[PDB]
């Protein structure tokens, strides 16, 4: 299943290098989320990251950057609830209940589902799995890590979204490098691309 990574809410030096390094290791999709931030900073980061990885990035802010930097698409959210006037491209959003995903997933390229790890139940999750409600178009989000990654693909999720379990592996000015982040990503990607689980 796909392994989606969400950026950190704030901008930090070396972020562009780390992101590029993650793409180089096969990062499927990158969700650019920088709440309440001057567009300027988003452009700076996007400029540093190799053009060829632009169609693998979805932005939660300043939707105009979508066509400006040839991004993949946009993710509607509380602060940015609607696509631009005559937008044409990949659109996605978050849902927070089995019902929401049910009456909305077909209106998006894919949707997020959270909090998987708390408001749902492993059992109702399985019931929603057989009902085909959850499929390759729904991405699991919320409290995902190396300990429960396999449990998610077991649910039939078309992907897993991570943020903290990944970026928390790096502390600026305290670490001499970001190896731990890249090494930990490869580990998660190996579990995600690890078919056998039956």
How far is 116 from 19, CA to CA, in rounded Å? 25
Cβ neighbors of 172 (< 8 A, separation 6 or more) are 12, 13, 14
Task: Label each residue of the chain as H, E or C.
Answer: CEEEEECCCCCCCCHHHHHHHHHHCCCCEEEECCCCCCHHHHHHHHHHCCHHHHHHEEECCCCCHHHHCCCCEEECCCCCCCCCCCCCCEEEEEECCHHHHHCCHHHCCEEEECCCCCCCCHHHHHHHHHCCCCCCCEEEECCCCCCCHHHHHHCCCCEEEECHHHHCCCCCCCCCCCHHHHHHHHHHHHHHCCCCCC
How many other CB atoms are there within 10 angstroms of residue 87's CB atom? 15
CB 91 within 8 A of CB 109: yes
End-to-end CA distance of the chain: give it in Å, rounded. 15
Indicate which CATH number applies to the domain containing 103: 3.20.20.70
Number of domains present in the structure of the chain: 1
Q: Report CA-CA distances (Å) from 189 to 22, 142, 153, 183, 193.
A: 11, 17, 12, 10, 6
How far is 67 from 179, CA to CA, in rounded Å? 32
Could you list the residue range(s) of the whole structural domain that residue 176 is in? 2-198
- Residue written as token pair 């729904």: 138
Cβ neighbors of 1 (< 8 A, separation 6 or more) are 152, 153, 157, 158, 159, 160, 192
Q: State this model's resolution in angstroms.
A: 2.3
CB 80 within 8 A of CB 64: no
């Amino acid at each position: 299943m796909k392994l989606i990574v969400v950026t950190t809410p704030t901008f930090f030096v070396e972020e562009d290098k780390i992101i590029t390094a993650l793409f180089e290791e096969g990062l499927d999709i990158l969700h650019l989320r920088k709440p309440e931030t001057p567009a300027m900073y988003s452009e700076r980061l996007l400029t540093l990251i190799p053009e060829k990885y632009h169609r693998r990035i979805v932005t939660h802010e300043h939707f105009y950057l979508k066509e400006e930097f040839n991004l993949m698409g946009i993710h509607l959210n509380a602060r940015n609830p609607s696509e631009p006037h005559d937008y044409a491209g990949h659109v996605s959003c978050s849902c927070h209940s089995v019902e929401e995903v049910k009456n909305r997933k077909h209106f998006y390229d894919y949707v997020f589902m959270s909090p998987i790890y708390s408001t749902y139940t492993a059992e109702e999750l399985r019931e929603a799995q057989k009902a085909k409600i959850i499929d390759s178009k729904v991405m699991a989000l919320g409290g995902i890590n190396e300990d429960n990654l396999l449990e998610i693909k077991d649910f039939g999720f078309g992907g897993a979204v991570v943020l903290g379990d990944l970026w928390n592996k790096f502390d600026a000015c305290l670490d001499q490098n970001y190896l731990a982040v890249i090494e930990h990503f490869k580990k998660l990607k190996k579990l995600a691309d690890l078919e056998h689980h039956h």
